[PDB]
Design a protein around this ligand. Structure first.
Ligand SMILES: CCCCCCCC/C=C/CCCCCCCC(=O)O[C@@H](COC(=O)CCCCCCCCCCCCCCC)COP(=O)([O-])OCC[N+](C)(C)C
Ligand SMILES: CCCCCCCC/C=C/CCCCCCCC(=O)O[C@@H](COC(=O)CCCCCCCCCCCCCCC)COP(=O)([O-])OCC[N+](C)(C)C
Ligand SMILES: CC(C)CCC[C@@H](C)[C@H]1CC[C@H]2[C@@H]3CC=C4C[C@@H](O)CC[C@]4(C)[C@H]3CC[C@]12C
Ligand SMILES: CC(C)CCC[C@@H](C)[C@H]1CC[C@H]2[C@@H]3CC=C4C[C@@H](O)CC[C@]4(C)[C@H]3CC[C@]12C
Ligand SMILES: CC(C)CCC[C@@H](C)[C@H]1CC[C@H]2[C@@H]3CC=C4C[C@@H](O)CC[C@]4(C)[C@H]3CC[C@]12C
Ligand SMILES: O=S1(=O)NCN(C2CC2)c2ccc(F)cc21
Ligand SMILES: O=S1(=O)NCN(C2CC2)c2ccc(F)cc21
Ligand SMILES: O=S1(=O)NCN(C2CC2)c2ccc(F)cc21
Ligand SMILES: O=S1(=O)NCN(C2CC2)c2ccc(F)cc21
Ligand SMILES: OC[C@H]1OC[C@@H](O)[C@@H](O)[C@@H]1O
Lengths: 446, 446, 446, 446
């Protein structure tokens, strides 16, 4: 006998698919998928003929309170029109009574879907983060302002106007140090904690030094302390890693398909978490609470949703929307299972198969083929802890900018000297080149 | 099967909210909340029906006035126009004289509502917090210490006495570089880490400077390590922590409703703290007494104010917003209780009901239901803040303080020696113009 | 009529007490307490005669499953031997059926008892905490070791042995700087980040400088970083402040009296916390699970227990064992209530009293008298955040120790000079005193 | 009322623990745990009695050997000496061929057990972590940068050329203090903040040193801020994170039980990673295969090892101790299931039972019961550690590294110039003894 063992199916992608091609019939070759390749191996060992038949109305099905009158693949079966049923069916309490299931061939579970953490893009000039945008300006104003005072005070101070009485003292000349540019030098050097050569000696100049030196120490120790906070706090941040983490978070908000066995567990929950979580479900039962998985994928993209879903469909989209990720552990336990009529001469024959193919490893091999594919951009790390270029970075651009300006002035130094010198001395450029290569004089002489 | 049971009630959150849907009237589904959930478990354990009724005056109820009549739900409960009154009725003397309440289903006290600390203006100082004021003075005292001691040691020491003679040998002249003033300079300059000349010599000084330098480092490192911690972990404190703390203060105003529960108490109260506050409250009985609880909330948010109501409404307002909190504990004690006409057995019938329903745990479960909301805990590590004008401004102030002090001493210096010129020099204002125009030479020579 | 309204009582301290004195009868004056002073006021307003009578067997009482046959003050009442019952009785489900209670006169609750946080005793030398006890020794070994090398290297280095060619060069003498003591000076100064005067010039001496300067920077920046951790983490520590905090803590362990209405709530709990908490109760049901309150006080003293108790007895012992404290909020709700027989002509007369005395405030006034007393050592703060002497402290002792040693050497300097000088020069002490007061020479001359 | 029901069972935690009390035997109270709690809810929903039975061989059961007989509970379940077998029996092919299991009450996989990271030997370095290796090389490169550039700028600049003439005016000799070697010194010395002479001059140099000093501060402050964070927040990582990661390694040995569930799989497995490991495991089939799971645990604790068992026993061992953890996920998939003789209806009768009992939620509740223990989470902020020899030792190593490098260059210097003596001086070893004994003068003069 054949009977075709009238086998019900349901389009879900990956489990079964229309063949992706041209030409006609493909009769029982039309459908190609996991369940197809499973069915194949069921056929090899027990032996039978398979005529695929999509169910009508396309339903997993359930006992609808109106009349019961199961609405789907359960229905083609219970009336014994159907035979074996090889599709996502999700063993349950209520379905088991009326129709007896095989033993599982897959272990799914409820878990959360969320977008991957994008990155930081610190803004390579992150070093200039820990204080305001405004304070750095005023610190710059102060070094000019204070330095302007050192010039005025020191110059006007009779206790400055010391003498450059050398190592050989007892001559008589005065020669201040605190000219203008050297005044800024005291400011910039103190501000960077390396002490310049020039120093106050008269009290007035010493007071201003003593206070700038205070003005420095607080800014720097505060710069150090902020940056330790920004870095420590960042290090101290964990992403969400559980329903409990999401439970305490009235930020990134929940999501779920309408009843779809997902609300079902939550309504009938007794977990304090999943009881609390349900509160928000009911709360925004117009917004989040979507009515399809395809939207729930689309929705997490646009925004900060966390769609609850069976783990199998997580795995597929994760590996095909690498923007996105699984999170958490398997919340619940369930498992798909090939359907059989009320107690029949196949359930105990179809079950030994599933155990047989298991030991040989064909299922997990089959698990890879359909769900796995092109190697995702998995390459990604969070070793960010140790700082790198993207963290600090900019200071090297600041370094480069510095060295460049020194060149341009150093050229400017050359021109100004020889020109002003040549004004009272020889013509113009005779000086320039003889002065150029006498800087070169292969020794420190002249 | 008798009279259903006429339940009188008033609309007031989170007890009696007008049910939210368009889906027109349904009687026993025109209302929900806690007051309705209590009736459910009440009518479940017992057996009866509601239908429901409402007020026709708004008022909870009170001994009316000179008429000595009764308004509110106490009206309705006297002349048998109704029966049970699950509603926020507060058990009091005058009420119990004319009706008979049930036993409490919930406790209640008078407490405080204040704008939560936000620590968004610590002060234009608070670079100075990270060490105790006790320390900041002791260290300045120690700078005066070692400067005074370095002066003693160095001088009495023979080896400190170099002889300059840099350029040359002989010329047995002697010098002592450390003066008293020069000794501060080492002390102050070392403490701010910029370092100075007057590098010691002659071992007796070198122990001193070494231990000082060790004294410098620990203080700065300790200052730095703490400003890190205060800016990592914000233990944001609160101004007051009680009625007593609130009582002694006058910057903050008390607040209370008007002609009501809270107001009545403090008038009739006879405790010190609570008599003192009726005075302040009586003093301006036009601007610390709002005429509605909603506006009472407002005064806290916009102005500085600390409203006094019942503990339960606070807990509601507390959760919904995020900036309002329960400063202190429970001053008074009261209890809501289900109304009942005089003599009616429905008192004792409910009396066992509420006792029973608690031992189960439902009132607490019901409590968690309708009072909890968003749950707003944020506490998101205090996403670290760019240090700015507020958190440090005084370092700019001590700066401009010292700069002005430098000008005044500098003009001071100018006059002092210009008159010590006059000792050997000519009269007085000669030396003035001489040295004033000594600055007007405008070069690096005399 | 009188009847004495036979009033039952139970020795508990504070509620009722034997009078503390000599001479006999004191007939109904014997007992003195809260309930006594309450009863007093009940008598003033309703009017009656009171004959105290301690119950026999001394029991709150309960329906013992053996025979029911209530075992206590409930028993003297239900048989109508007794009358009013003014004592701690704790309104409940089961007691209410058989005997009808008045309305509460006290609002107790379950809460936790724990010892106060003692302190820190940081060990005043806490500055020397952040690194090991061992590393500081080796850093000290290194400054001697490295300095020993600078002497050897520099002295043996022909590029050192420069000339003290002064400001007037072109003479011919050599005069190293890096003698021994100045070598240590380079070490100690570099280690404290202030740069000494002496500097390497020859490469060999420059390499060792460059590496010590690295050896410094890591130690100090690590000293800073550890100390920021020890301080931050301490700041980041909260004490326990809830049953949930204690729930997550398999450290400081639970405690409770045997059944005593405390286990009762926990067994019949449905809170995930109080269900989890019960797990450990049952677990160590021989150790913690004490059989009396007096032990439970004694036990928390000895060790790290957290005895669960009704709030009233918390309040008393807290204010009389100031070592100890209340913690958490009221977990449960209950409330004492004067007992009355099955429905009787007093419950509705005794209840208006309790409400009457409330409004006048006599209860809370009475609440103070017995529970309050001698002002506890309440003076206590946790403003520890800003560091003070106890935190750092020691460095000032280190400072003092430094200055002292400098004196002793500075004396040693004086003796060594004049003696060695006087050896080739005048006698012994003629030099000493003429040298003493010529250091004084009121100017820097000689 | 029929046969009670003979339940065969094996003692194995946390399922079947011999009940703990002295209180001698009670049949149905000789045993408790999960296996017994399941029977409870099983016999409750159903109706029957246990009495109970045990094994008489110890073994769970297996196809015996050459005899082809059956031991264990599979013996007892064949020849109707018993009935249901609530016990940790694992559903497999050979078992299901001769009996008929129920449907799973729990899932199960093969996974890994490894000694939890303790981060108690980060390394004798890890003062070098807080910035990326990418950075530590770039900054040294920049020191070579600015030293080389300062050399260029300074020299070509006219104004850098001071003329010493300190003691005196004229003598128009010129100097250039910045050599190439002296330019490193500024660079290196500035970077370690000790500061140096060669303080620049002549503006073109001053921009360079300023930007360098700004480059110094950010790096040190960033280093300091991070070593704070790494020592505040210990994100202690793990060596491996999978079988693949474990597979490529050989420092760590795999581990597995022996002649059993786990071992059988990897032999019969045909996946790359799992074929590679049978090789290593086969290679030494005498020291990576313990002969008991208890000793298997041990090898992880004492030695370095990574044991392979079933996921459930791991979760048990995981909670009880605190140092053992579940590295990775679930390799295989299995499921425990209640035994039943062939054809018996008690399979399908229980089948609805387990489905029902889950939808309630009890199996999860039962799961939380007997697997959770102490719950050991400690994570007590990582009570901060006195930095020591481990966390920093390399700073002492780079020190002793450089000191040895200084001696070798120093002797290098000695020879080099001693032979540049010989140019003008006499032969070779003359200058040796001259300068060797030049050190033996033993004073500060030639
Ligand atoms: C980034 C790559 C460039 C690297 C720089 C290139 C190398 C720079 C040089 C390196 C050698 C070592 C440092 C300088 C000399 C040593 C000082 C001394 O002891 O005496 C010297 C005094 O001379 C000086 O002090 C200055 C020397 C430079 C003079 C003129 C510039 C030409 C150098 C090129 C600049 C190009 C600029 C590039 C333009 C694009 C005299 O030396 P001597 O009489 O010969 O014998 C003793 C010298 N001994 C120490 C070897 C024993
Ligand atoms: C802790 C409490 C002790 C405080 C110290 C006590 C006060 C110390 C003094 C303070 C005055 C200010 C500083 C020193 C003098 C100023 C320098 C100068 O310009 O010329 C002076 C050079 O003299 C010196 O440089 C050294 C002076 C001390 C010489 C001998 C020690 C006696 C001082 C006592 C030590 C006791 C040690 C204690 C023993 C237990 C010459 O001064 P003049 O020729 O007179 O006129 C110019 C001076 N004018 C600047 C005022 C205009
Ligand atoms: C010191 C001399 C050279 C002037 C330099 C400019 C500095 C000192 C000026 C410019 C901007 C100023 C600040 C502008 C605004 C505020 C906010 C105010 O609520 C307190 C003062 C404070 C914080 C000012 C303090 C002084 C300040 C920082
Ligand atoms: C540098 C010269 C002067 C010697 C000074 C002594 C210093 C450098 C010595 C004394 C103690 C030594 C340490 C003793 C123990 C250990 C632990 C070992 O697992 C690595 C080496 C290490 C960390 C040593 C490194 C060098 C050390 C720090
Ligand atoms: C690899 C080792 C052995 C050799 C490296 C060369 C070093 C050690 C030596 C060789 C000759 C030396 C130079 C020769 C003379 C002088 C002049 C002096 O006023 C300053 C130092 C200076 C400029 C020396 C600097 C260091 C120097 C460059
Ligand atoms: O004797 S009771 O009416 N029974 C329980 N209730 C409450 C539900 C809060 C309370 C709360 C406080 C009381 F003082 C008494 C009672
Ligand atoms: O309205 S009551 O029955 N009588 C007054 N009190 C008392 C503070 C004793 C309380 C305290 C709490 C209540 F819930 C009820 C009452
Ligand atoms: O269809 S089931 O027998 N019913 C539920 N169970 C579990 C209790 C874990 C599981 C767990 C994993 C499955 F694959 C199937 C089932
Ligand atoms: O012994 S089974 O009924 N058949 C084999 N399978 C798997 C498909 C993996 C599983 C997976 C998990 C189970 F709990 C049971 C089974
Ligand atoms: O048995 C405990 C283990 O830990 C200590 C170490 O010395 C090992 O040799 C030892 O075996």
């Amino acid at each position: 006998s054949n009977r075709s063992l009238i086998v019900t199916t349901i389009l879900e992608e990956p489990y079964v698919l229309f063949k992706k091609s041209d030409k006609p019939l493909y009769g029982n070759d039309r459908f190609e998928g996991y369940c197809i390749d499973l069915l194949r191996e069921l056929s090899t060992i027990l032996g039978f003929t398979y005529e695929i038949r999509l169910v009508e109305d396309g339903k997993y099905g359930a006992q609808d309170d109106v009349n019961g009158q199961w609405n789907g693949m359960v229905r083609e079966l219970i009336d014994h029109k159907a035979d074996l049923a090889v599709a996502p069916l999700a063993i349950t309490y209520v379905r088991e009574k009326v129709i007896d299931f095989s033993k599982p061939f897959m272990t799914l579970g409820i878990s959360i879907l969320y977008r991957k953490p994008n990155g930081t893009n610190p803004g390579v000039f992150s070093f200039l983060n820990p204080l305001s945008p405004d304070i750095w300006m005023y610190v710059l104003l102060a070094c000019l302002g204070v330095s302007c005072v050192l010039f005025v005070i020191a110059r006007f101070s009779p206790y400055e106007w010391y003498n450059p009485h050398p190592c050989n003292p007892d001559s008589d000349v005065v020669e201040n140090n605190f000219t203008l540019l050297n005044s800024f030098w005291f400011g910039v050097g103190a501000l960077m904690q390396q002490g310049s050569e020039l120093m106050p000696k008269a009290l007035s100049t010493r007071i201003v030094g003593g206070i700038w030196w205070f003005f420095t120490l607080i800014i720097i120790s505060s710069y150090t302390a902020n940056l330790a906070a920004f870095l420590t706090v960042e290090r101290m941040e964990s992403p969400i890693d559980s329903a409990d983490d999401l439970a305490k978070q009235t930020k990134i908000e929940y999501g779920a398909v309408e009843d779809g066995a997902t609300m079902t567990f939550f309504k009938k929950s007794k977990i304090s978490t999943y009881d609390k979580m349900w509160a928000f479900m009911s709360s925004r039962r117009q917004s989040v609470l979507v009515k399809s998985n395809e939207e729930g994928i689309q929705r997490v993209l646009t925004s900060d949703y966390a769609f609850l879903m069976e783990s199998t469909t997580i795995e597929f989209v994760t590996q095909r929307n690498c923007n996105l990720t699984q999170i958490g552990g398997l919340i619940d336990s369930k498992g798909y299972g090939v359907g059989t009529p009320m107690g029949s001469p196949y359930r105990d024959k179809i079950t030994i198969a599933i155990l047989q193919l298991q030991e040989e490893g064909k299922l997990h091999m089959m698990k890879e083929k359909w769900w796995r594919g092109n190697g995702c951009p998995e390459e990604e790390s969070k070793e960010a802890s140790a700082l790198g270029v993207q963290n600090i970075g900019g200071i090297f651009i600041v370094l480069a900018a510095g060295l460049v300006l020194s060149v341009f002035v150093a050229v400017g130094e050359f021109l100004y000297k020889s020109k002003k010198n040549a004004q009272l001395e020889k013509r113009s450029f005779c000086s320039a080149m003889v002065e150029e290569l006498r800087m070169s004089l292969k020794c420190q002489r002249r």
